[PDB]
């Protein structure tokens, strides 16, 4: 295997493919990148067994076919450490790979390419293309609501659903939930799959905000996304994900509308004096007014009064202020609508001028 290529043509690919690597976790081989030269193309692959990130680079200079694996971090650091505009010549020398540039020489240890983990072949059952920004909006709008290390591992991921002419994402940890849907102009079969937490992050990080669209392929046990010269593929999580339709409040008759930023800043200041453990704050809703209060064990107290639009009945309701702030931070709109029922029922929050995304938060008891 042999190839010479510009430093800048390797940086992004190396950065992207090193994404699935959690340092030196499982097998030693997983800390290595798979290098393969076939045709006039160099392929780089990083994996963690659960997912895989593949980069393809055009080889305009002379090359020889072959494959091997090398330590990801070191190879990347070497390439990054070389001067800008540097030509990097790489050649496999038996058990080691020689990297040369200018008067800099590096010999890296290898591991048989034949032993590099690879996701078994699978077949896609659903395919569609959509703008990168759309996939970005979908993930960002709900990512913060995925569970982290919950026993019900199926919650430690994000649901991706194709329904009608829309793609939807759902995330929840049992206390709060986020759902968002966008139209892709393509008639799609009804399908639902759970993407592992790390896959969601990798997918998100894989977007360059470019104009080039994203090609998504979904199978019974895998999901794949092609962006430019990168191909990401991840296994899916098994288990029945809760139905957001069953979680959305059934009778949120009381509707409060307020400026998202004044609301966020008020909750932010009040949170300072909330219990560090439970983060509870109290909301007192009255005609066109919202009063937010917080107190902690040492009996300190925060009180915020805001003008809002509300004509319903008076009520008090508690919430984990972090869950509320997470929502207001994700909405980043002008005004938000809070739809309540009672003090022991969840609340649905959403942009006052858009129902494409909805958030559900269970109140706290106190």
């Amino acid at each position: 295997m042999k190839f010479t290529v510009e430093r800048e043509h390797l940086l992004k690919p190396l950065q992207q493919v090193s994404g699935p690597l959690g340092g030196r976790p499982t097998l030693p081989i997983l800390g290595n990148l798979l290098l393969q030269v076939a045709d006039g193309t160099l392929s780089l692959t990083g994996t963690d067994l659960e997912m895989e990130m593949v980069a393809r680079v055009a080889l305009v200079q002379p090359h020889e076919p072959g494959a091997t694996t090398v330590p990801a971090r070191k190879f990347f650091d070497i390439c990054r450490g070389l001067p800008e505009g540097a030509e990097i010549a790489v050649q496999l020398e038996g058990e080691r790979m020689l990297v040369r540039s200018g008067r800099s020489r590096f010999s890296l240890s290898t591991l048989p390419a034949a032993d590099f983990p690879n996701l078994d072949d699978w077949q896609s059952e659903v395919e569609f293309t959509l703008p990168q920004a759309t996939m970005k909006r979908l993930i960002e709008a709900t990512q913060f609501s995925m569970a982290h290390q919950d026993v019900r591992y199926y919650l430690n991921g994000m649901l991706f659903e194709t329904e009608g002419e829309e793609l939807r994402t759902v995330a929840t940890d049992g206390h709060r939930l986020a759902v968002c849907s966008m139209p892709i102009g393509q008639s799609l079969p009804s399908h639902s799959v759970i993407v592992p937490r790390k896959g969601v992050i990798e997918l998100m990080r894989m977007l360059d905000g470019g104009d080039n669209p994203l090609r998504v392929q979904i199978g019974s046990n895998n999901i794949r996304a092609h962006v430019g010269d990168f191909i990401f593929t991840s296994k899916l999580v098994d288990g029945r994900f809760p139905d957001y339709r069953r979680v959305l409040p059934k009778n949120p008759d009381k509707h409060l509308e307020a400026g998202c930023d004044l609301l966020k800043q008020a909750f932010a200041r009040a949170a300072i004096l909330s219990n560090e453990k439970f983060r509870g704050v109290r909301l007192y809703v009255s005609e066109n007014q919202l009063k937010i209060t917080a107190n902690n064990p040492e009996q300190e107290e925060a009180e915020e009064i805001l003008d809002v639009t509300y004509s319903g009945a008076e009520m008090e309701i508690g919430f984990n202020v972090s869950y509320v702030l997470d929502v207001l931070n994700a909405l980043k709109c002008e005004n938000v609508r809070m739809m309540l029922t009672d003090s022991v029922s969840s609340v649905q929050i959403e942009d006052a001028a858009s129902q494409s995304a909805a958030y559900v938060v269970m109140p706290m008891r106190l």
Binding site: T172, G174, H175, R176, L177, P242, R246, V247, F278, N320, V344, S346, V360, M362, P363, M364, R365, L366
Partner: peptide, 6 residues
């Protein structure tokens, strides 16, 4: 304390 959606 905290309530659960499901």
């Amino acid at each position: 304390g905290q309530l659960g959606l499901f």
